[PDB]
Amino acid sequence: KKRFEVKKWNAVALWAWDIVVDNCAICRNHIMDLCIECQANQASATSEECTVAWGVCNHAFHFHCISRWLKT
Amino acid sequence: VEEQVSTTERVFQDRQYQIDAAIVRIMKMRKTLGHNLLVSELYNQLKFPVKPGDLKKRIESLIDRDYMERDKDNPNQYHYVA
Amino acid sequence: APINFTSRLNRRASFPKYGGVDGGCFDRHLIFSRFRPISVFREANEDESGFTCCAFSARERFLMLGTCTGQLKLYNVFSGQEEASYNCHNSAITHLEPSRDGSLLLTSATWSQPLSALWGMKSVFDMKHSFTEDHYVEFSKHSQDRVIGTKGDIAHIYDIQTGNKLLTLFNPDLANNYKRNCATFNPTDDLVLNDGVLWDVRSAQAIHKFDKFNMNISGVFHPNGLEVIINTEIWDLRTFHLLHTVPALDQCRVVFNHTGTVMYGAMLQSPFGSSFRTFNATDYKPIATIDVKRNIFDLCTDTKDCYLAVIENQGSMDALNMDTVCRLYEV
Amino acid sequence: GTAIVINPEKDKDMVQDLLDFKDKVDHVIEVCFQKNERFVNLMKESFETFINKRPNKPAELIAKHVDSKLRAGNKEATDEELERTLDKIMILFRFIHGKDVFEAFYKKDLAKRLLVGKSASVDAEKSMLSKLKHECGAAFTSKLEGMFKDMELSKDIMVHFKQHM
């Protein structure tokens, strides 16, 4: 009784391990919080410049608290 | 076109990451190493070589974050920080 | 409200579900107080056994047992026949646990590196990941793609798709330094109990720290999502209030069954006790002590609460003069 | 060779023109210079030297040229042609730096092929991933291969969801 009717629908969604992963493997602290070294003028006074990165296993982490181990 | 712009930005941002991760991943095996050698090591370490403009900027930030330091009383001479 | 089976059972005619009062809160004390041995598992081609741990497989087709030598052995759950044998570690296996899907097995050793590892069960017993810092390994309770390892008093949580470490939870000052700390998830996978400390999985800060009642057992979560035991102390995991204490849980490796109605475990200090106990999950009220008269290395129940698989030392509990076999008792 | 790579005005054909020039040179050496190593080894070095003249422009062109052939809409409709063109096009990918350009653009059109409409060929799509791993490292296609895997996983999932529905 309508001019148009849908018969098929293929919905798409992006999948992430929230997994209470608003946290970190090396750091503990929540990813939207400051990465320890940004809670004080340690790595930087610019606490607002502390960013968040994603990996390849459905989760995120602080940019700084993980990349700091590259020298190690 | 908008999609080409977004993919172009992704390339830029990925290059910007590599030049931040690099340098830190350099020096450790070459404790004393200058700017002209760092760009050369970066040519080989990076997927895409970095211009001296971006390189100097990343170096200064990497010094503030204790990954590298200057030596030999020379703006272009660097040493690994442990 | 009769105590006796005959009266309680006849009442079912007008008072369904069970008849009388209490029901399972009473009847569990008639069944989990009467254990009798049915069968035993031993290593093929060996004279004496060296099992240290066990678990039933995901589909309960076989019992999985770990040896003192770091091997995994799979036995037919019905016949007692060894079907397969794999190497996992170079020393005694402290823990074995399958996923619900049965794709992979979590194993860990008391010493040999990697202390924990992810081994495949489907098709090929290969490795997915080696964890050299994790003494104890365990699956989460709701979402099993996430697995928790224990490094001393530090919790390490990884996703088994690669074994990549996701989050850690620790604090040396809050830590009670338990001898057998085995970090574990709550039923809702948003709290971790690590060395007596309850961790907020959504902030990685401690939410609460429990007193060091014991030195060996850091505690286990109840499936009701309310109670957590720290050796003997029963705490409210929602408010962190103390609710009850049961001394019968002291040195008892108490875990729960599928339905969350039965809790059971072996006694600890070859640091093993010579008996095991069963408890009423309703309130941890002890049901019975089973007089095995053999040092017990480990134990597990099945989904159907039919037989409890207990690893008992029939030898002298020596390093070499030992005979640890897995003897199954019917409830 | 420089005349082709140095002029973006013909970008759309730059990959094919550089590949054609490379073959013309190699043909000359094979047939009349008797495959003398002096010219064989230098040919490659000369081409690497000028092919990587722009800020990795060829990588974008490679991603678009292989993706265009691989698109079901107005497809070649044969595997011989899809393989022939993806191979020749992808070969130039090994003469340049900044391979991120390919991945950044490729993954956008790859995502389209894996979600909406069809690819010209599944085997051709997999062939590209194999060609990319070589001379880049397996890590290069880790995300790109994972994208494919997700849809194979989705196929089983959507079946089970209907069963539950």
mmCIF file with all atom_site columns, all heavy atoms in Angstrom, chain C residues 141-155, unseen atoms left out:
data_model
loop_
_atom_site.group_PDB
_atom_site.id
_atom_site.type_symbol
_atom_site.label_atom_id
_atom_site.label_alt_id
_atom_site.label_comp_id
_atom_site.label_asym_id
_atom_site.label_entity_id
_atom_site.label_seq_id
_atom_site.pdbx_PDB_ins_code
_atom_site.Cartn_x
_atom_site.Cartn_y
_atom_site.Cartn_z
_atom_site.occupancy
_atom_site.B_iso_or_equiv
_atom_site.pdbx_formal_charge
_atom_site.auth_seq_id
_atom_site.auth_comp_id
_atom_site.auth_asym_id
_atom_site.auth_atom_id
_atom_site.pdbx_PDB_model_num
ATOM 1  N N  . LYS C 1 141 ? 34.550 -14.213 33.241 1.00 0.00 ? 141 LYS C N  1
ATOM 2  C CA . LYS C 1 141 ? 33.353 -15.012 33.484 1.00 0.00 ? 141 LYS C CA 1
ATOM 3  C C  . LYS C 1 141 ? 32.205 -14.752 32.510 1.00 0.00 ? 141 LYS C C  1
ATOM 4  O O  . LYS C 1 141 ? 31.344 -15.613 32.319 1.00 0.00 ? 141 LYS C O  1
ATOM 5  C CB . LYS C 1 141 ? 32.898 -14.829 34.930 1.00 0.00 ? 141 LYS C CB 1
ATOM 6  N N  . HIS C 1 142 ? 32.184 -13.581 31.890 1.00 0.00 ? 142 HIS C N  1
ATOM 7  C CA . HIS C 1 142 ? 31.110 -13.268 30.964 1.00 0.00 ? 142 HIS C CA 1
ATOM 8  C C  . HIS C 1 142 ? 31.643 -13.191 29.535 1.00 0.00 ? 142 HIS C C  1
ATOM 9  O O  . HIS C 1 142 ? 31.151 -13.886 28.643 1.00 0.00 ? 142 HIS C O  1
ATOM 10 C CB . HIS C 1 142 ? 30.392 -11.979 31.379 1.00 0.00 ? 142 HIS C CB 1
ATOM 11 N N  . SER C 1 143 ? 32.712 -12.424 29.340 1.00 0.00 ? 143 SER C N  1
ATOM 12 C CA . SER C 1 143 ? 33.322 -12.293 28.019 1.00 0.00 ? 143 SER C CA 1
ATOM 13 C C  . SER C 1 143 ? 34.710 -12.921 28.021 1.00 0.00 ? 143 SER C C  1
ATOM 14 O O  . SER C 1 143 ? 35.693 -12.290 28.420 1.00 0.00 ? 143 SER C O  1
ATOM 15 C CB . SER C 1 143 ? 33.412 -10.834 27.628 1.00 0.00 ? 143 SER C CB 1
ATOM 16 N N  . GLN C 1 144 ? 34.805 -14.143 27.499 1.00 0.00 ? 144 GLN C N  1
ATOM 17 C CA . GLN C 1 144 ? 35.998 -14.966 27.687 1.00 0.00 ? 144 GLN C CA 1
ATOM 18 C C  . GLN C 1 144 ? 37.113 -14.693 26.699 1.00 0.00 ? 144 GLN C C  1
ATOM 19 O O  . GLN C 1 144 ? 38.145 -15.361 26.717 1.00 0.00 ? 144 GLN C O  1
ATOM 20 C CB . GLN C 1 144 ? 35.654 -16.447 27.661 1.00 0.00 ? 144 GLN C CB 1
ATOM 21 N N  . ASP C 1 145 ? 36.929 -13.698 25.857 1.00 0.00 ? 145 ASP C N  1
ATOM 22 C CA . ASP C 1 145 ? 37.996 -13.313 24.955 1.00 0.00 ? 145 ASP C CA 1
ATOM 23 C C  . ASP C 1 145 ? 39.073 -12.614 25.773 1.00 0.00 ? 145 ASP C C  1
ATOM 24 O O  . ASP C 1 145 ? 40.220 -12.474 25.348 1.00 0.00 ? 145 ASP C O  1
ATOM 25 C CB . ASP C 1 145 ? 37.468 -12.389 23.867 1.00 0.00 ? 145 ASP C CB 1
ATOM 26 N N  . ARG C 1 146 ? 38.685 -12.152 26.956 1.00 0.00 ? 146 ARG C N  1
ATOM 27 C CA . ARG C 1 146 ? 39.606 -11.472 27.845 1.00 0.00 ? 146 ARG C CA 1
ATOM 28 C C  . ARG C 1 146 ? 40.049 -12.401 28.974 1.00 0.00 ? 146 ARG C C  1
ATOM 29 O O  . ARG C 1 146 ? 39.226 -13.031 29.644 1.00 0.00 ? 146 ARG C O  1
ATOM 30 C CB . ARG C 1 146 ? 38.964 -10.214 28.381 1.00 0.00 ? 146 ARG C CB 1
ATOM 31 N N  . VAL C 1 147 ? 41.361 -12.509 29.142 1.00 0.00 ? 147 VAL C N  1
ATOM 32 C CA . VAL C 1 147 ? 41.967 -13.425 30.103 1.00 0.00 ? 147 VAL C CA 1
ATOM 33 C C  . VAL C 1 147 ? 42.894 -12.711 31.075 1.00 0.00 ? 147 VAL C C  1
ATOM 34 O O  . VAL C 1 147 ? 43.604 -11.777 30.704 1.00 0.00 ? 147 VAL C O  1
ATOM 35 C CB . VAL C 1 147 ? 42.725 -14.528 29.349 1.00 0.00 ? 147 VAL C CB 1
ATOM 36 N N  . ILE C 1 148 ? 42.836 -13.115 32.338 1.00 0.00 ? 148 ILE C N  1
ATOM 37 C CA . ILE C 1 148 ? 43.638 -12.484 33.372 1.00 0.00 ? 148 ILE C CA 1
ATOM 38 C C  . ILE C 1 148 ? 44.771 -13.377 33.868 1.00 0.00 ? 148 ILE C C  1
ATOM 39 O O  . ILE C 1 148 ? 44.567 -14.544 34.201 1.00 0.00 ? 148 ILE C O  1
ATOM 40 C CB . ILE C 1 148 ? 42.737 -12.028 34.542 1.00 0.00 ? 148 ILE C CB 1
ATOM 41 N N  . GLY C 1 149 ? 45.977 -12.823 33.871 1.00 0.00 ? 149 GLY C N  1
ATOM 42 C CA . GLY C 1 149 ? 47.158 -13.498 34.385 1.00 0.00 ? 149 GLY C CA 1
ATOM 43 C C  . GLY C 1 149 ? 47.600 -12.871 35.706 1.00 0.00 ? 149 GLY C C  1
ATOM 44 O O  . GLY C 1 149 ? 47.319 -11.700 35.973 1.00 0.00 ? 149 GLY C O  1
ATOM 45 N N  . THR C 1 150 ? 48.352 -13.622 36.509 1.00 0.00 ? 150 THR C N  1
ATOM 46 C CA . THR C 1 150 ? 48.838 -13.079 37.774 1.00 0.00 ? 150 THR C CA 1
ATOM 47 C C  . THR C 1 150 ? 50.354 -13.143 37.880 1.00 0.00 ? 150 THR C C  1
ATOM 48 O O  . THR C 1 150 ? 50.950 -14.223 37.826 1.00 0.00 ? 150 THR C O  1
ATOM 49 C CB . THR C 1 150 ? 48.231 -13.824 38.976 1.00 0.00 ? 150 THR C CB 1
ATOM 50 N N  . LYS C 1 151 ? 50.946 -11.987 38.158 1.00 0.00 ? 151 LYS C N  1
ATOM 51 C CA . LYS C 1 151 ? 52.381 -11.822 38.370 1.00 0.00 ? 151 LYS C CA 1
ATOM 52 C C  . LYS C 1 151 ? 52.648 -11.361 39.794 1.00 0.00 ? 151 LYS C C  1
ATOM 53 O O  . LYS C 1 151 ? 52.664 -10.164 40.064 1.00 0.00 ? 151 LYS C O  1
ATOM 54 C CB . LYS C 1 151 ? 52.916 -10.756 37.418 1.00 0.00 ? 151 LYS C CB 1
ATOM 55 N N  . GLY C 1 152 ? 52.860 -12.291 40.713 1.00 0.00 ? 152 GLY C N  1
ATOM 56 C CA . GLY C 1 152 ? 52.955 -11.872 42.104 1.00 0.00 ? 152 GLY C CA 1
ATOM 57 C C  . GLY C 1 152 ? 51.626 -11.253 42.510 1.00 0.00 ? 152 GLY C C  1
ATOM 58 O O  . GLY C 1 152 ? 50.609 -11.943 42.551 1.00 0.00 ? 152 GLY C O  1
ATOM 59 N N  . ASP C 1 153 ? 51.654 -9.968  42.868 1.00 0.00 ? 153 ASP C N  1
ATOM 60 C CA . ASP C 1 153 ? 50.455 -9.247  43.275 1.00 0.00 ? 153 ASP C CA 1
ATOM 61 C C  . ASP C 1 153 ? 49.918 -8.342  42.161 1.00 0.00 ? 153 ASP C C  1
ATOM 62 O O  . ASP C 1 153 ? 49.098 -7.461  42.411 1.00 0.00 ? 153 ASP C O  1
ATOM 63 C CB . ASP C 1 153 ? 50.747 -8.415  44.519 1.00 0.00 ? 153 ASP C CB 1
ATOM 64 N N  . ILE C 1 154 ? 50.376 -8.561  40.929 1.00 0.00 ? 154 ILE C N  1
ATOM 65 C CA . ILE C 1 154 ? 49.958 -7.748  39.788 1.00 0.00 ? 154 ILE C CA 1
ATOM 66 C C  . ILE C 1 154 ? 49.050 -8.499  38.821 1.00 0.00 ? 154 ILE C C  1
ATOM 67 O O  . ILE C 1 154 ? 49.365 -9.605  38.381 1.00 0.00 ? 154 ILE C O  1
ATOM 68 C CB . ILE C 1 154 ? 51.185 -7.222  39.012 1.00 0.00 ? 154 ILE C CB 1
ATOM 69 N N  . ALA C 1 155 ? 47.916 -7.887  38.479 1.00 0.00 ? 155 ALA C N  1
ATOM 70 C CA . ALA C 1 155 ? 47.006 -8.474  37.502 1.00 0.00 ? 155 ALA C CA 1
ATOM 71 C C  . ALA C 1 155 ? 47.352 -7.999  36.096 1.00 0.00 ? 155 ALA C C  1
ATOM 72 O O  . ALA C 1 155 ? 47.523 -6.800  35.862 1.00 0.00 ? 155 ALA C O  1
ATOM 73 C CB . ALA C 1 155 ? 45.570 -8.116  37.833 1.00 0.00 ? 155 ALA C CB 1
#
